[PDB]
Amino acid sequence: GRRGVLMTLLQQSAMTLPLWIGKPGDKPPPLCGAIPASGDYVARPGDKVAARVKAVDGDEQWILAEVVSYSHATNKYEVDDIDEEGKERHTLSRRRVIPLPQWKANPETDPEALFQKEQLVLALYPQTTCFYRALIHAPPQRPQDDYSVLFEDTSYADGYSPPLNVAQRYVVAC
């Protein structure tokens, strides 16, 4: 069903994210883990993004999406929802598009390319294709590991979810 197709697609993308393998003297590039995009970077068609989209009824979400085009005439992207049920190709300003990392940072070689404990991030919430505010609880220790995060969640008395796992592909700066 659609649920399964979606979750499978998310796994595929998380798992296929290449590990950055430098040699002595190299630094992790832009979009390796937590290293931000260069100033005035523009994502390429096919690249995955978090995209701030307003529904017809006004609800704003950061959704998982893919760049379709960028117009230098208007400085706007087109992006497509990675969910087939999202039938609208969205036009967005650069401020509504955050490139996802193109490399996984290896905690054993480039730990400065990971988010620090208690950093505020946007992270994809389990069983969804959307990003929400969270604090880093634990970084990955090994290249296969997920982040552990605490989502802001007003259904808890302290305002945070328990530790939930999110892959490096799906954690970006807030």
């Binding site: 979400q61 929802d81 969910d83 919430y125 069983q127 969804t128 959307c130």
Partner: peptide, 8 residues
């Protein structure tokens, strides 16, 4: 998209 509100 699949939202948290839908998910929960």
């Amino acid at each position: 998209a699949r939202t948290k509100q839908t998910a929960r």
